[PDB]
């Protein structure tokens, strides 16, 4: 057993708050916000050795990242930002920092009860997205 066992699995979005405002703050344009905000993604998390894979699949976009904790990687986000990302474990929370164009956003993923809670922060704007096991 290991590092991220309680994250691994298939998860489905069941609530969202403030995501349109988070997307605005990150710079997402109107049409992408409207379509992306309608999506109900499934989040699939797996681990193989030291490599963690997080997939997001929805009607809007399918994305996938694979990474080693603490080791920077390049990521193209669902809104087509070219970012440099680092994901660490901090006290049982996966902390994902994305840097681009002198900007930064942080996405935290945590297990709370039977849920996986995602908090996305850009400057003073936070969005909370709650996932349940599929
Ligand atoms: O998994 C979640 O639900 C949220 C965490 C992953 C994440 N997705 C986005 C995002 C940004 C822009 C656009 Cl268009 C669509 C998606 N930002 O953070």
From Swiss-Prot:
Motif (Nuclear localization signal): 24-34
Entry keyword Nucleus: yes
Major subcellular location class: cytoplasm
GO biological process: brown fat cell differentiation; cellular response to lithium ion; cellular response to tumor necrosis factor; cholesterol homeostasis; fatty acid transport; long-chain fatty acid transport; negative regulation of DNA-templated transcription; positive regulation of cold-induced thermogenesis
InterPro entries found in the cross-reference section: Calycin, Fatty_acid-bd, ILBP, Lipocln_cytosolic_FA-bd_dom
Post-translational modification N-acetylcysteine, affected residues: 4
Cell location: Cytoplasm; Nucleus
Impact when changing residue 25 to D: In a breast cancer sample; somatic mutation
Any Gene Ontology CC annotation: nucleus
Keyword Nucleus included in the entry's annotation: yes
Similarity annotation: Belongs to the calycin superfamily. Fatty-acid binding protein (FABP) family.
Protein name listed in UniProt: Fatty acid-binding protein, adipocyte
